[PDB]
Structures are given as structure tokens and as C-alpha cells.
Amino acid sequence: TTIMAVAFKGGVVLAADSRTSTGTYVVNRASNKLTKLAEKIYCCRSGSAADTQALAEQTANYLESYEIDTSKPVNVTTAANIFKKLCYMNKWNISAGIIVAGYDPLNGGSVYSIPSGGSCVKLDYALGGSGSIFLYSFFDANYKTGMSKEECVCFCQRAVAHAYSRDGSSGGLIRTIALHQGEPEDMTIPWTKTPYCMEKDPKYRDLAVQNPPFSSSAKITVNQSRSE
Amino acid sequence: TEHDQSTDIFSADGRVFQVEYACKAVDNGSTAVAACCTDGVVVAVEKILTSRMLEEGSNDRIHAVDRQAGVCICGMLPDGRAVVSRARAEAENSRDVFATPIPGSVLASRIGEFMHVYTTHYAYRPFGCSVIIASYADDGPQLFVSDPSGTVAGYYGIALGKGKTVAKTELEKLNFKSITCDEAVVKLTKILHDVHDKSKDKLYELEVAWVCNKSNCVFQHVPNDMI
């Protein structure tokens, strides 16, 4: 999996790849890892799908009850704390890494990481899943504060694509969603329009010279293509 | 007239008399007034002293329930106190479970629900207090009353107890769109001093608290140099 969320001024963007795998074989190539928790709060799920589906469903059930009582839209910090507690109480029984992000009028766009073990950290961006370890340096090198909604969607799409081109365990579609004072905006990019893959990157077009012909010179030139 | 011995029973007219009687405790207790202002809420109560040899701070009717919220118990004091502990558990619950200071409307709802339940089981009796709730959380200044029935209502200004019909007449002459926490502390104290009966209760002091923008939205007894 590769999940991430990024804050921009006024909102957040959440992004994810679309693959569910048993290790070597893809059982679903079109999952939806961006799960809705309330009108403007979503989470990005990584780890066991069974666990993170059950905890998201449970977190959503609690927040809908709380919003009816209070009669108010719910703040991101509430979503994050409810989830966190579920992730902490069950830490030994699950495999889950979660990102909760959202928009609310009191604190704007916010992002919480809730990794394995059930800590909860409030950030400007968060990465998660197996594919995350390829993006730290990407973000360190290329990410900036101050990005608009449109810059941030585009940047997320390009990060996911970099991750999933090198991570065997990520791949497929790129889904995003942008949450802000206006209406939720979702987007799905098919693999055939991905902004990056190694298959289309010109520095990987020409093949390594692993198979030179039997020759009378130590000079290396081209791969042998036809029998002698 | 066996119909008035348990609160698990309607009377033939649809009344619940155990709850009426408990309301009578409140109506014969001491007089409290409150005011919801532009910048906060102020409460004032009159403590009838049973003895000149009490330390000051004895039988306090105003208690903090959370950093930003407090209650003034009118009626029987120990009943009121059980209501204060529930109110604190609720306030704590909201910070623990939902990461938010409890909203004032929600805290009052939960107090009502709590008082209501002792109106329905043969084994318990209604509470013999009303509880004024004063809050100033993300929903702004709020003043609610819960009563022994469990009815909860929001107010701009209010008065409970024996003086309450006159105090209500004076609270009607205020102006609730302008008045501040500083002016109210003065005016409410004047109303408790006028509705006070001198024949019957010779020893009293006034208690007064507030949650305002001055106090950095912390519920607290007002500093004693302002009466």
C-alpha cells in the first residue's frame, strides 16, 4: 500500500494506490483505501484490510452518534482520538497504520498519523504503508509548504506513482480526495495515465548489457539478439 | 391517596407527585440568581448560615465541573453534590473520549437525563435540588437550569428558591444584549440583598462565581474584593 495526506491552506488532500495483495498475487486491483468517517473527515487505511475496515466502520458509527447529540459537525481531532484509542486498545491483535485527515471550521485542514502501536501525531503531511519508505526523500527534496489545492492534488498523484513504481506491493489506480470548506472532490487516475512509471521513463528504455555475444574482444557493445 | 408514595406511578390526572414534592424542597431553599452576558456568565447564591462559627467556604453551593463550566446547587445540598460528581464524569468523558471540552448544551442535556432517571424507578427518589449550569466552551456563554423532573431549559437570566418571584421581577429590568460580567456582579448582588428576609434568616453570606473573557474562560469564584 502507499497512502498519504497533505495539508494545504484551507484543506487536505488524501491519496492512495488501489492494490490489495496476498504478498505475491493481487486479489483486488481496485480497492478503495480512502474511507469516509464523516462528511469532511476521511481516513487512509493500510495494513490488514479486515482490521482497518472494522476500525473505520466503528469509528464512523461513533462520530455519527456524536454529531446528532451535539448537533454540530465534528472536528478532526475527535475522529483522530476515537480511532487512536481503538488502535491502542487493540494494538497486539491487529496490523493497522492509519491516517485521519479532514476539514473542520475551527482548525481548518488537519492530518494525524496513527501508526502501528497506536500513537497519534499531528502533522503537515503523513506517509504510510509499505510504499511510504520510498517517499520520505521525495518529500524532503520536492515538497513545499504553501501549495494550493491543485498543486497538492497533482503532487500527491505524482508521489503515489513514484512509490508504486518501485513497490511490488502497491499499484493500480491512484485515488485522491480533497476536503475543504466546499464540496468533497474525488479523483481516480488509471494506470494508463499515471504521471510516472519506469516503463515510460526514457532512462530505462535501453536494456542493460547482460548478454553480449561471444567475441574476440573484451569490448562490450550490445546484447546478442539473434543466434549465430 | 396511595398514589403519591412512589415516583414509579402516575396519578389519575397524569401527574407524578413524588416529583412535585421534591420540587417543593427547591422552592423553600435559599435564593440564587444568574445572568448570561456578552462576555460570560455570572451566578450568585445566598448561603443561609446555620451558625456564626462556620469557617468561610463551608457549604459552598457553587462547584467547578470542568475548566470552563460550573454548577450552582439550589435545594438540598448533598443531593446537589451527587449531581456535581456526575457532571464532572461527563465533562471528563468528553475530554477523554472525544478530545473536546464538553459543550454547555450537551452537559446540561446529560445532567437532565441523569435527574430524569431517578424519576422512573420504584427504588429511588427524585433529587431535591435544581442545578444551574454555567458554561463558556466553543458554543459561547450558556446558562441552563435542570430541575428534579429532569427538564432542562436555557435562559438569559434566572432566579430560584424562596425569593424567586421578586428576584425575577428585577432580572426583567436588566438588558441582556449590553450587560457585561462586571456590571452583573454588581446588579445580582443588589437583588439578593433586597429579596433577603431579615426576620427569618439572620446569618447569611453571598457566594458569586463566573466564567468570562477576563478569567480566561475559567470558571471560578469571583475575587472577594468586588461586592
Side-chain angles (χ1 to χ4, degrees), chain A residues 56-218:
Chain A
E57 274 150 5
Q58 210 178 150
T59 304
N61 178 249
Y62 294 141
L63 286 164
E64 163 186 66
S65 310
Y66 179 74
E67 181 170 349
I68 284 151
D69 219 29
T70 59
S71 301
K72 293 174 72 160
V74 335
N75 306 309
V76 178
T77 170
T78 287
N81 211 54
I82 289 179
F83 222 129
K84 168 194 179 42
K85 149 128 198 201
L86 287 171
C87 279
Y88 187 74
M89 293 328 230
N90 294 291
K91 48 183 199 219
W92 291 121
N93 295 319
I94 74 192
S95 135
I98 295 294
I99 299 173
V100 170
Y103 171 87
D104 74 78
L106 194 59
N107 287 314
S110 330
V111 180
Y112 293 87
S113 198
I114 307 178
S116 270
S119 66
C120 174
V121 181
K122 179 176 189 323
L123 296 157
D124 189 57
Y125 73 77
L127 303 182
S130 70
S132 52
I133 194 87
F134 296 104
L135 288 190
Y136 282 110
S137 291
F138 193 61
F139 268 65
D140 289 356
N142 296 141
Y143 172 77
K144 309 223 64 208
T145 28
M147 269 187 313
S148 68
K149 179 179 65 190
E150 298 72 12
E151 290 162 1
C152 199
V153 165
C154 155
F155 174 86
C156 287
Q157 284 163 176
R158 183 170 152 248
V160 174
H162 272 282
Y164 65 36
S165 297
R166 293 283 181 173
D167 183 26
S169 301
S170 293
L173 301 171
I174 296 173
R175 313 201 178 266
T176 63
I177 185 178
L179 293 173
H180 54 79
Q181 42 146 58
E183 288 272 55
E185 303 160 50
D186 66 68
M187 183 50 69
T188 289
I189 299 312
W191 182 80
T192 61
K193 309 238 195 66
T194 194
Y196 179 77
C197 48
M198 291 189 296
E199 302 88 327
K200 286 157 178 178
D201 181 350
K203 64 186 173 284
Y204 305 125
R205 198 178 49 62
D206 81 57
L207 291 175
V209 187
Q210 295 296 101
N211 299 336
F214 188 49
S215 71
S216 307
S217 163

Side-chain angles (χ1 to χ4, degrees), chain B:
Chain B
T1 45
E2 250 192 60
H3 59 275
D4 82 339
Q5 294 285 314
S6 208
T7 189
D8 64 330
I9 282 176
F10 287 90
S11 97
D13 238 287
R15 291 170 57 193
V16 183
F17 277 102
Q18 276 298 281
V19 173
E20 312 193 346
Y21 293 160
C23 284
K24 221 105 74 184
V26 186
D27 305 339
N28 295 323
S30 47
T31 313
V33 293
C36 197
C37 308
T38 49
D39 28 308
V41 189
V42 178
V43 208
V45 69
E46 155 182 320
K47 275 153 61 157
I48 310 313
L49 293 175
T50 178
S51 181
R52 46 223 302 294
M53 299 193 304
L54 296 156
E55 192 93 276
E56 275 144 20
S58 183
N59 312 111
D60 263 353
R61 284 174 174 282
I62 300 177
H63 305 268
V65 293
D66 195 9
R67 168 166 159 114
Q68 79 282 352
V71 302
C72 177
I73 296 157
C74 317
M76 281 197 163
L77 194 49
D79 261 5
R81 197 77 224 246
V83 178
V84 164
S85 329
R86 187 45 163 264
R88 286 173 181 181
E90 297 294 291
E92 282 159 14
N93 190 245
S94 168
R95 300 181 169 255
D96 294 351
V97 168
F98 302 110
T100 35
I102 200 153
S105 82
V106 172
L107 173 64
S109 134
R110 282 290 102 79
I111 280 162
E113 281 141 48
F114 178 65
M115 296 175 72
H116 173 248
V117 93
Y118 288 71
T119 70
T120 65
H121 186 305
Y122 72 95
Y124 298 80
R125 59 154 177 74
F127 286 108
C129 58
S130 283
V131 171
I132 307 205
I133 303 137
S135 186
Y136 185 161
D138 287 297
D139 52 341
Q142 306 279 317
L143 174 60
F144 292 88
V145 183
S146 182
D147 71 28
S149 74
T151 303
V152 180
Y155 280 99
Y156 293 112
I158 195 49
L160 308 177
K162 61 163 145 298
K164 77 171 137 114
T165 287
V166 176
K168 204 94 94 280
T169 293
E170 293 286 314
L171 277 179
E172 275 175 287
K173 294 195 191 79
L174 304 196
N175 175 55
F176 284 98
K177 308 207 157 168
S178 296
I179 195 174
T180 66
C181 276
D182 281 16
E183 301 151 61
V185 171
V186 176
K187 294 215 215 180
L188 268 38
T189 50
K190 204 218 174 190
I191 294 168
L192 292 186
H193 279 309
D194 302 349
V195 297
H196 179 62
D197 183 44
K198 320 178 70 163
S199 315
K200 190 175 280 286
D201 308 303
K202 314 198 184 188
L203 297 164
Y204 69 109
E205 54 179 42
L206 298 203
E207 193 190 354
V208 188
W210 71 5
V211 57
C212 42
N213 295 304
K214 266 199 151 65
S215 94
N216 181 218
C217 273
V218 174
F219 188 82
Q220 81 182 184
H221 280 75
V222 318
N224 266 304
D225 55 82
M226 238 170 289
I227 291 175

